[PDB]
Structure 1
């Protein structure tokens, strides 16, 4: 059977393609599996940091005991740096010999790599990303709740007010701006809430005028332009907060903020409320980090699943080739 011969040869040639891509398959497999192990170490570090942030938000924790948690925080920051600078550097893209994350003289951590992914050919027609890049994994994560950030203004607050991380509850109505939220005394002497924005002008109330503004209610939801957030405690006329859109920000920066927030004073009721708005932000930012690394793990696991699915196709072709021959 010149057909039988033809088959024999096609099996010869497909079998050789399988052998010729082994080094690569093994190569792609080790690299990915090794990355997973590092990413999972980062998740372990992040979880430990989350537990610190939850602990740090408890009002009945000493100032001294709170400060000492800052030391562990640093240990975990270092862990993350280590993982990010794992070695040829894993998370630096095409700049193999360049240390991806380093600390500049301003005090901010910066990324020295580039954003190029390497793709390994594991079959004639299949290409699989073999690495991730430091900018994507550790550096570009959204601040605040993921959509907007809340920080205390330059004029420091004198009350015990603090804000939750909030959320965008109505996307249709969402409007990005740099909002300022201020509390003021009414004409009748009561505490009222006001909100305005650079681009949007006066939001709550449109009037701008205190007498038109809604009374402050502790633990109540204040909402405007698609957003919604809860102020707690007793603010003082004059106190204010900035609500801004979310910056990209590295896991590292988040932990630095943690270290700084842990070192703030924490015995007086006013002092504690100062830390709280920020406590709520950092919890979000850790969860954003946690979620974010998970998505990189998920995509890494997808890339594995491309490669295992190819190996199955192989093992099935041998089983069928056997059957013929």
Structure 2
């Protein structure tokens, strides 16, 4: 009884200590994530100009260098140390730097996915960290469901493509699609789509003459997806369309830099920019959003903690009274 309460109060001090420390690690983490949104908000301002055809090559190659500063900024945030001199986003691997760049050239994650849960009342565990694989690395490319790149065949025309979206989830079919512009037996430009698993979808016959013709800025739709083609392509120009792929914010920014550095003087060079600009905007956003969800998650936990601070002072105010009412037996 009394040795039991003694050990209950010993439990409570630990539960309050664990809470105080959780509350703090998490608020430190809110501020790093908060910083990292700042960086992305600006990367988004930047990406939007990269799609503005006013800007001189000089203006853009200068944004390229700002984007390089922002990339470096985000690597510092991902590799932040918390109160101990151990990394906040590395998971259980406390002294391994979470994000680095192999000589392969891609950025990798050297942590794990393991969260420390902590007792902060008798039956509530709360996570006191997040991990880099969740926060920074796995974010889908494209519009979140499908991505659009050029093929190995550079395009000769001025065609560009929106990020588009899935409009009918039931009609949706994941596949590797190829969109090929070519000719009617009449002479009209026409739009074809086929795919590894699906064979021909537009049109099912694959015949140019059974094919829909290309209206500038018109919505092309197949297997649950819609997108819009702008500019004037030439026959043989092609785009590839593929399931979304996990891809770090880091390579997203590496990519905004590669793009700001492309030739951007002739109308033909400027359209090979746009298709990819539209994509990179979606990715910057996907990532803005993804981090906000990590922030929302973190908020919920803090509200679980401010819950626990009232509930541990309730469970002590009660143990104190069990002592007063038990010492009265004496």
Deviation at 1:10, TM superposition (A): 9.2
Separation in 1, partners of 2:69, 2:168: 40
Secondary structure in structure 2 of the residue aligned to 1:320: helix
Aligned mates of 1:215, 1:75 — CA distance in 2: 45
What secondary structure sits across from 2:268 in the alignment? Answer: helix
> CA separation in 2, counterparts of 1:121 and 1:99?
27
Secondary structure, in 3 states, of the residue corresponding to 1:231? strand
Aligned length: 318
Measure the CA separation in 2 of the matches of 1:90 and 1:171. Answer: 38
State the secondary structure of the residue aligned to 2:23: helix
How has the CA–CA distance of structure 1 residues 252 and 25 changed in structure 2, closer, same or farther, with 3 Å as cutoff? Answer: same
Give the distance between the partners of 1:15 and 1:272, measured in 2 at CA.
70
Moved more, 237-246 or 23-32: 23-32
The Cα offsets for residues 152-174 of structure 1, whole Å up to 9 and x where unpaired, read as 11100011100000100000000
Separation in 2, partners of 1:232, 1:323: 76
Q: Encode CA deviations 1:183-224: one digit per residue, 9 max, x unaligned.
A: 001111111000000000001011101111111000000000
Q: Offset at 1:278?
A: 0.2
Range with bigger deviation, 304-313 or 238-247: 304-313
How far did residue 312 of structure 1 move? Answer: 2.3
| Larger mean Cα displacement after TM superposition, 286-295 or 21-30 | 21-30
Structure 1 residue aligned with 2:224: 226
**How many angstroms does 1:314 deviate by?**
3.3
What is the aligned partner in structure 1 of residue 328 from structure 2?
none
| Distance (whole Å) between structure 1 residues aligned to residue 261 and residue 291 of structure 2 | 27
Give deviations 1:121-146, integer Å, cap 9, x for gaps: 11121111111111111011100000
In structure 2, do the counterparts of structure 1 residues 20 and 244 end up closer, same or farther at CA, with 3 Å as the change threshold?
Answer: closer
8 Å contact 2:121–2:312 — kept in the other structure? Answer: no
Match of 1:266 in 2: 264
Partners of 2:319 and 2:111 in 1: how far apart?
46
Q: Distance in 2 between the 1:19 and 1:256 partners? A: 48
- The answer on whether the counterparts of 2:140 and 2:247 sit within 8 Å (CA) in structure 1 is yes
Structure 2's unaligned 5+ residue stretches are: 323-330
Q: 2:158·2:232 contact (CA, 8 Å) conserved in 1?
A: yes
SS for the counterpart of 1:18 is: helix
| 3-state secondary structure, aligned to 2:119 | strand
Q: SS at the partner of 2:286?
A: helix
TM-score normalised by L of structure 2: 0.92
**How far off is 1:21 after superposition?**
2.2
Residues 310-319 or 73-82, more deviating: 310-319
Distance 1:40 1:11 in 2: 42
Checking the alignment, whether the CA contact within 8 Å between 2:9 and 2:319 is kept in structure 1 is no
Alpha-carbon distance in structure 1 between the residues aligned to 2:226 and 2:144 = 13
Q: Is the 8 A contact 2:121 2:311 kept in 1?
A: no
Consecutive unaligned residues of structure 1, counting only runs of 5 or more, are 1-6
Deviation at 1:16, TM superposition (A): 5.4
